[PDB]
């Protein structure tokens, strides 16, 4: 079939949903596209190049809140940003593992530079704005990785028997399993953002 | 060599450091131990059982702050807990990916039940105490996963050229690369803990 960059990415993303990241291979990608392995190699040199490409394109296609609204508060920005990033990550199987494989690509430079600029324009030092940005990013990635890898694990083997589960754990597992960890995520996100505002407002005060 | 549970885990942990999680296989484990594949199978049925086992034993051996001190504040507990968990995760290559592969094992039930009990005894509902616990866990796992997967990626291929890197990103990457993300982690951790205290103290007040 067609092997322009866009069509190769569509095919790889389709495969990632069928196989997960551990089982995606350039060999299965060639089979999906109806081509021989040496033909694919011209286009895609190895799995790492593919995964670097997917990490960028997933956000390009599906992460719609990279940039703040005109007049948006930094608190509202981090909230809308984190929600949009979580969604984009959860859209593909093993999405958070796909993202973690790289730091900002050249194609993202403009976007992430503006993010950093925006924090600094709202009273943060670059260092403190970068710590806020990183905290949000990592909190969100860990939350999504736990969701996703819980699915992976379950398809091999069932959860343990609650013959043995003590009461609060039973109840807690039932709690993290009533939605797809959204409540836990949104509650933790507000905690994080307030934590940051307390720090920013304190200036040089012992706090 | 010896194939009691303990010696099998020592050998697998040694292999994980040599190969990383993606490349650890029951075949290379058999070679390390000097045994045939069918002999290993008696002891270790597949990679998933092995990885579930490693996730538990890494914390059993190297995570020394699972439980609060007598009279410790919940704020001090979450801080010491998170620091000890980060260290235990960073001790082995791809440690955070090893952990994420499962939820609490039966062998951990007693520990994690006590953690949940402790929050509830310090003014949190089980739901809010579980959200604090989860937020900390996920923040810490994301921070460690990013560190570790940055190493994995670099061994394939170099970071991009700063011919193109805009100024704040250059400076930010230089910032997340001056220690092993410890400063960013400790700063975000204090933000998270304060965020939680603001929430707990507010009770029913609009906040
Ligand atoms: C500033 C970026 C950065 C700086 C230094 C080291 C890094 O590894 C990064 C990133 O990887 C970032 C992301 O991945 C973003 O998710 C990122 O790339 C992204 C985006 N493309 O819109 C975001 O929305 C960001 N968001 C907070 C989750 C976040 C970035 O802000 C950073
Ligand atoms: C309460 C546990 C839990 C509840 C519901 C769903 C879960 O997936 C979990 C865990 O996985 C926990 C951990 O992994 C701990 O890291 C966990 O197992 C652990 C430990 N063994 O000492 C910790 O120190 C915990 N810490 C906050 C990082 C954390 C646990 O509190 C939870
Ligand atoms: Cl075609
Ligand atoms: Cl073509
Ligand atoms: Cl021996
Ligand atoms: Cl033996
Ligand atoms: Mg990133
Ligand atoms: Mg866990």
From Swiss-Prot, chains A, B:
Name of this chain's protein: Tetracycline repressor protein class D
Domain HTH tetR-type span(s) in chain numbering: 2-62
Role, per record: TetR is the repressor of the tetracycline resistance element; its N-terminal region forms a helix-turn-helix structure and binds DNA. Binding of tetracycline to TetR reduces the repressor affinity for the tetracycline resistance gene (tetA) promoter operator sites.
Any GO BP annotation: negative regulation of DNA-templated transcription
Organism for this UniProt entry: Escherichia coli
A single MF term (Gene Ontology): DNA-binding transcription factor activity
Annotated binding of tetracycline, by residue: 63, 81
Assembly mode: Homodimer.
DNA-binding span(s): 25-44
Sites where the protein binds Mg(2+): 99
Induction note: By the [Mg-tetracycline]+ complex.
Highest taxon in the source lineage: Bacteria
Pfam families: TetR_C_1 (PF02909), TetR_N (PF00440)
Key words, A-Z: Antibiotic resistance, DNA-binding, Magnesium, Metal-binding, Plasmid, Repressor, Transcription, Transcription regulation
The keyword DNA-binding is assigned to this record: yes
